[PDB]
Amino acid sequence: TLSLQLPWVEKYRPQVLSDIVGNKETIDRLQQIAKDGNMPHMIISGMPGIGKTTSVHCLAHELLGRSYADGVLELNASDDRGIDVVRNQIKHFAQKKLHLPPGKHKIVILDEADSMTAGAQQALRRTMELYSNSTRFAFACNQSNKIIEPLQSRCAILRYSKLSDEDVLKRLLQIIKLEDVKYTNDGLEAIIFTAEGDMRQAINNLQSTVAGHGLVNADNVFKIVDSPHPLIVKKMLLASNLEDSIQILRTDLWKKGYSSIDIVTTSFRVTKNLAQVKESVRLEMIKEIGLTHMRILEGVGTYLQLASMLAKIHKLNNK
Amino acid sequence: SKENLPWVEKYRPETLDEVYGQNEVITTVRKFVDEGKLPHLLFYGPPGTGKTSTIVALAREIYGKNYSNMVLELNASDDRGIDVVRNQIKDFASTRQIFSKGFKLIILDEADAMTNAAQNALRRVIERYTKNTRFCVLANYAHKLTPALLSRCTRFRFQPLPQEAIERRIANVLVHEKLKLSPNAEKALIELSNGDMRRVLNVLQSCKATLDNPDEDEISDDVIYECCGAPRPSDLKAVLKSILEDDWGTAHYTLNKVRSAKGLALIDLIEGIVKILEDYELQNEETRVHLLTKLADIEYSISKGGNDQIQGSAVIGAIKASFENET
Amino acid sequence: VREEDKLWTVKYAPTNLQQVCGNKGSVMKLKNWLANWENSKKNSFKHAGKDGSGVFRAAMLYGPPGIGKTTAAHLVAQELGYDILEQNASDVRSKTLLNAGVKNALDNMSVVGYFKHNEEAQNLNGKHFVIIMDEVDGMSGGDRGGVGQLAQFCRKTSTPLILICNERNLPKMRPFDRVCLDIQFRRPDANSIKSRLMTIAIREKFKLDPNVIDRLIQTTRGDIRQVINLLSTISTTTKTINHENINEISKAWEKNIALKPFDIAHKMLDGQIYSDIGSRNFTLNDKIALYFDDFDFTPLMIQENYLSTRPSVLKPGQSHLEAVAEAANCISLGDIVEKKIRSSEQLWSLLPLHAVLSSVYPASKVAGHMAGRINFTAWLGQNSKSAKYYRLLQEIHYHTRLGTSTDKIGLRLDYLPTFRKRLLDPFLKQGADAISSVIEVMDDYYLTKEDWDSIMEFFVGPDVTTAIIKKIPATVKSGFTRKYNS
Amino acid sequence: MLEAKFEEASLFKRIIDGFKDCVQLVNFQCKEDGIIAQAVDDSRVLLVSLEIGVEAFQEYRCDHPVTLGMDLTSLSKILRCGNNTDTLTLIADNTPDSIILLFEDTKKDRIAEYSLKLMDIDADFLKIEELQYDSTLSLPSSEFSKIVRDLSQLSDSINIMITKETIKFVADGDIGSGSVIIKPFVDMEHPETSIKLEMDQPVDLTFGAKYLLDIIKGSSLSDRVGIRLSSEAPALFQFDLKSGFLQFFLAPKFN
Amino acid sequence: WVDKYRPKSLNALSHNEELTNFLKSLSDQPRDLPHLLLYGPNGTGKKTRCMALLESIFGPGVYRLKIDVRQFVTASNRKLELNVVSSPYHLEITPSDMGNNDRIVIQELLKEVAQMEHRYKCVIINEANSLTKDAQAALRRTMEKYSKNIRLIMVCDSMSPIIAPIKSRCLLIRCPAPSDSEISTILSDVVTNERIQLETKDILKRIAQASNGNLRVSLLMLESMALNNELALKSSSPIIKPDWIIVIHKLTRKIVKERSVNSLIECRAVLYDLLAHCIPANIILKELTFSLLDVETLNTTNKSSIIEYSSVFDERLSLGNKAIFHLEGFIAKVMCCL
DNA sequence: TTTTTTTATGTACTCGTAGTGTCT
DNA sequence: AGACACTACGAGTACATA
Ligand SMILES: Nc1ncnc2c1ncn2[C@@H]1O[C@H](COP(=O)(O)OP(=O)(O)OP(O)(O)=S)[C@@H](O)[C@H]1O
Ligand SMILES: Nc1ncnc2c1ncn2[C@@H]1O[C@H](COP(=O)(O)OP(=O)(O)OP(O)(O)=S)[C@@H](O)[C@H]1O
Ligand SMILES: Nc1ncnc2c1ncn2[C@@H]1O[C@H](COP(=O)(O)OP(=O)(O)OP(O)(O)=S)[C@@H](O)[C@H]1O
Ligand SMILES: Nc1ncnc2c1ncn2[C@@H]1O[C@H](COP(=O)(O)OP(=O)(O)O)[C@@H](O)[C@H]1O
Ligand SMILES: [Mg+2]
Ligand SMILES: [Mg+2]
Ligand SMILES: [Mg+2]
């Protein structure tokens, strides 16, 4: 082996806002903005792998044309983004003179805006306020709550949502048509099921299955990618009889190499996000799961502790 | 010389053909490397499954014998912060190889101890430099990794070593060493391993040291049990029978003589009785609830110390009161 | 520069004081304060006046962001002839160079006001400065940031000082409590912003009805800048806005701001949230996010005011006392979890669990109506007082160790009930001739006058010496103080 | 038993200062022909190869090949403990451990005995790179270090372009851009200020600013530095000393 | 006064003759002496007996001691200030004067004293119960590595929080509280030396019956009631009780009288006022439970639940740091029980 | 309606004495 | 030979932690 090929997430990364199968409303909004111009300050929030960075990249590219190289300032979490950088480099870029069309503006893309320090975020306020006629700011984050309210007050808020089954299925069908891959309906269904609204993870699993077996079938997808971790935990907690939950915990989780810490954390998260049972029983189950986690963290993490946790949960459900 | 390293280090796999147990992931990785499309890997699994050995043999097969120079291997022993990422990992990804031509490999072993800021800075390094370098993240707990970093890599779950592969490795070791092993001794050895090759190699070296002979004899179950201090199924079932059927004082005397004749530990007996009673087809699950709760409480109390006799009597009374509901 | 290149917030920015929306009282108060500034400096700020403005040489504007604090400040600055100067956290603000510059600028005149125009009869104030500080709450916590330096600046200056921050009552902002005149800009009224939106919509050919601005500003929570940005963002695609698509717009532009530890206590102790209907609207995840908004004061507030409500979620056959007891048990369990968190091994991954045991479960146990007022947690002040008393007892014990040969608690519990009878009681039953005995007893254990004063503060219950020391004749006290001072 | 005695004790100081910043640990191989050292940067972007023959050592005695693994932040401290008119003596027993440095003054009577604990570096460093390059130039070390330090302030990437009798150093950043263009000339009045360039095919590749700034730190060794460039090959920055050389194999950045 | 009449040697002890003989036996050969841990009720006289044993191991100059100061630097720039009681033959440290920084002081100070060194220097660790588990783990190996220069004499009131390794690493000496007769005989000598007037001797016995074996409390209460009776104790002299005990008794009266949330608020207020005046919460809980069990209005069913809840919340308080968070919970559970 | 709660490493900032290459 | 701009590494001070 001498060199590798580009992954399908990067190779087929959308370069035009029409290729994005994300939220239709915000996509058409950004398309009309790039068509008319006058892009305002924006903050795009959501979950990983739904088309946030690609969306702002496509918007900046379409809005700047050939001037993307000298009119767009990209700053990721991999670069220093402290108070000193915001004071010197961002201010020098915003004050920089540049002849642009009468409908375009300089764009400052800040990836992972939820990781910037409080000082830099505070200094960015007047930085984006005094140069709001020749410099525009686009933040891309996962938690909008991590960005201070003064910064959110000066910009639009675009909340991206999960991708429905139809959109990811359409994108995967387009990729298969563009790549000439042998597939089947159940295989694509299993891929979308294991993706959980994650387009990047879906394309990655598809490419991995293709390069590992050639045929995208549910058997191959399940043998190369295990079933989602939270769903088995939910089925274990929602069991009606103690023996069924014990057998599930033994075979699916413990016999497959899942650590006790991961199991108890997934149980806590599922019970927190559960909606089948009432509030009080959910709080009692969370209490028992936390009592178990307090022993798991102390190094007493074994199968007996998880079995006792399941027994206590069933006793609580035993009226 | 390799004759000075312990058996866990001496028998470390150097090629991908010496990594037993993992077949579905090993074949897929071999195909990834032969065809060229090697994505960002995330080896998640319990300790002693062979993730580090797998990735080391993979890098050896990819770059040759000069692996130690063309691969950037970082671990928890090295300082892995956000500035360390920014400087070292970005300078490694952005530049090219000094010894040959080809893609680079960054092995972030034990990356479950990295800071959240480090992962937040690295998740954009993996996405930006993806045409000249790759990333391999090894983990034992998938909850310490951010979902953004967890979604950029292809996940491979290292299952615990099954019976066939662990017996194959045991046979390989018995071929490499002047040593013989009994079949029942081998089965007992596989039983006390839980798919951990490190434990098997360590106790095999220890029982070879226990032999006291020039190795003209065999290694039986007695040697393994006396060297690892693990209780035998015979004494286990005898204690369980005396607890379930015999009298309180007789059960106490039996437990005392069993735990004092071979110097066994109460926690090992607890785990053994838990494993044995798991196959018992029982009545209404209240007995199982009481048994599991009381046994876990006693185990958590033992994990902090106390009176061994009081805890043994507590185990006896808990098992008895749990089984008294089955009538 | 063209017209379509500026945002709607900039092209519709107020050009004069008559276009500001709401908070007319605050802008008039600050205008009167800046007008009488020279009248205040000519008599050295001794005469406050009927408005009460003139004794403070600095003004601190505090309120939510986006209501026009900086705008109104700049407008009055340009209208009253004062030469404006702005500096804020976006520029370097430290103890070294910022202090030097501001000190050199407090009593220096402006060259811009001199060279621009100084010959007409406009005002004698053009030579003066107005140092307008923005994002005052954005400085560093310690003294090196410059918050205390600015607090001291607001004490000695010959130029008006204007301070503008978004969050006022903070620890970092404690020095600004009694040094600058406080002006609070509040939520604007709906009528002015409604008229402004009508104008900016009829100007941009934007179809919009008067029935929606109410819900708009309600979900926006008093932020005209965010409202203008919202209209500028959505007007490009949906030309006409009405009661049909307003739901999606409100759901997509919800202002997600963290609540103070007082509103968190109100939301936690709200019985409607834990009802069968309210449970599936404000889910448990939102309840945990409520605690995670401020995880330092939420458990203390919950433990303080969980037993001061009227429960409406009492199970059939359960009284208020039973629910309070279960809530207190869960409070103790959450306290154990918190101790395990903030100790060695740094088990911070147990923070969500501490969310449920400390705040969520006890509040759910006694959720209902608020009987009285939401009282702030007194555990902080009680802990500070206990720490001070422990330090004083430690000094007393290390002073008396040479004779007592006991521990701190062993000296507080048993020795002090006798030290009280030995030291103070001879003063009440013998007069002023028992001073020498008390002096000898105190020197027998190397006690001091401050030690004697601190000893009498440890007793409680039926022995409160705070009035007994006042019942002692002042002659005896003065004689004792003079004798020990010789 | 390794026994080396230097003519000037400051030459070893100037040599180690070259690797002090760009290299952390070293593994000196001492044989009958001289001392060789090969090291890799922490980020593995550059490779340092030092070779000093027995011509530099005033006295030399190597009974068998010796491997001395050591740290540079301690060797530099031990070397700064010397003196300008002193002589240096390296001693190592039959089994390599705790290398001994001896500083002896030649004007007065003084003995400074220092020790350094060795370290067991498993990674071997014996690789040699002998391949033809696309261009070979030679220029004064001060003139190259000046251009490097002047262009490092503009950006973090410096592009080298070799064309038909033209050497261009470009640096494009956020505050502006810059490019220094030089032509190979022959200076008869002083040979150490001439610029030579033998090219076979045009070259165009970029380096990082930090490694290029660390490389020019070795300019205090020789008065002239050679640069060998090739199509996607480790660029050879060589400083030739009167008994050997120090060569940095630098890896460019992919475009 | 307690301090004016205190034994200074082993031959000056006046109770627990078997313990005095055991101490003389242990001090017969002083160089081959292992580490010692004195445990027993608070106020028995173990701190006097340790000094008396040191007076037998060394010269009489052991009591001529001085107080010095030593500064320490933690992982941050917070300066830890600790005063040390030192003597030309021994030194005394009390790690109960700080927070979670006991390990630093313990390890550094003990290593300095052990590196500098009859032939060894004795170390008296006062109130070993406040020693955190990490400090005890740090002292575990320091006790064994330096056994020829440093010998530990740890004074504590209960070996419950002491870890098992430390318990094994030192001899254990129990100090039982003196009988009421010995306390009465000591009070007799004190009142004949302090020239007190006793109409009937039995009052002294009652003092013992009010002290529960505590001699430190007994002598202090005798002297406190001698100042109220003007150096002449009568046949019915009132018993002087500390203020916090009266507050706790009034709290129990309020508990048994009213059981509601409105009374729970004032109970929390009383708990806050008690905790703010340097009163530990474990002693508060112990006294509150013991005086609640004395309430004759309750029955066995109530007292059993009360003692169970007190044990549970004592475990909670030993596992927690916010003491009022457990005290209020115990009070609410008791209110729910009654 | 109002201000502190231990230890523990990672992150970020600043002043800061210091070590060395350069200019009247 | 020397003075002082440039500079980079070291102690101080806080700020989070799902
Ligand atoms: N709507 C979409 N249509 C097509 N491809 C998509 C879409 N969303 C994501 N992808 C694919 O996913 C890759 C990565 O998407 P990103 O935008 O980087 O994910 P993200 O939404 O920004 O979440 P992050 O970066 O983890 S916070 C792209 O290069 C595409 O291949
Ligand atoms: N599949 C395997 N085949 C053969 N030997 C194995 C296998 N897995 C583990 N071993 C042995 O166990 C040793 C340790 O393996 P590692 O790869 O270091 O364990 P690991 O899977 O990385 O788990 P960690 O390091 O605790 S996270 C190897 O050197 C081998 O001797
Ligand atoms: N009362 C108001 N009437 C009209 N427009 C307003 C009003 N308040 C704010 N705006 C608009 O909001 C823009 C910014 O106003 P600012 O005064 O800078 O906000 P702020 O109240 O100072 O809050 P900051 O800047 O976050 S501290 C102005 O240029 C106006 O377009
Ligand atoms: N054998 C004894 N005879 C008389 N008094 C004693 C005796 N032992 C102790 N005491 C008294 O006990 C007091 C000190 O008590 P102390 O030892 O500090 O209590 P603790 O044992 O709780 O540390 C001294 O004032 C002393 O008078
Ligand atoms: Mg992204
Ligand atoms: Mg490993
Ligand atoms: Mg403002």
Side-chain angles (χ1 to χ4, degrees), chain A residues 170-215:
Chain A
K170 167 190 178 184
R171 186 60 191 178
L172 285 194
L173 284 177
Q174 289 179 181
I175 293 187
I176 294 315
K177 174 92 162 303
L178 263 284
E179 290 267 310
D180 192 308
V181 186
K182 325 301 151 293
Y183 73 100
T184 175
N185 300 135
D186 57 296
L188 288 192
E189 281 266 330
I191 285 282
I192 306 292
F193 168 70
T194 43
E196 189 146 70
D198 197 351
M199 172 73 64
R200 171 195 313 165
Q201 180 71 19
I203 302 175
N204 271 356
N205 290 334
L206 176 75
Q207 180 183 336
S208 160
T209 306
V210 170
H213 297 259
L215 170 64

Side-chain angles (χ1 to χ4, degrees), chain E residues 47-64:
Chain E
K47 259 298 303 193
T48 79
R49 278 159 196 277
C50 88
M51 299 205 66
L53 182 84
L54 293 190
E55 173 276 348
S56 57
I57 299 173
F58 313 102
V62 57
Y63 289 97
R64 323 176 300 106

Side-chain angles (χ1 to χ4, degrees), chain A residues 125 129 150 154, chain C residues 9-10 12-14 19-21 64-71 164 166 196 224-225 228:
Chain A
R125 299 170 50 176
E129 200 72 343
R154 318 160 180 269
Chain C
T9 175
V10 194
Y12 290 135
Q19 322 166 340
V20 196
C21 284
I67 55 190
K69 298 177 292 297
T70 301
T71 298
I164 303 175
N166 293 127
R196 194 57 154 175
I224 310 143
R225 210 211 326 257
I228 293 174

Side-chain angles (χ1 to χ4, degrees), chain C residues 74-99:
Chain C
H74 288 188
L75 281 178
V76 307
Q78 307 145 39
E79 174 276 348
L80 267 193
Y82 290 72
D83 184 67
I84 195 155
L85 175 142
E86 59 85 12
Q87 216 155 81
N88 44 31
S90 313
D91 203 88
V92 303
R93 293 211 296 185
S94 198
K95 188 212 169 43
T96 35
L97 83 169
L98 172 134
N99 153 86

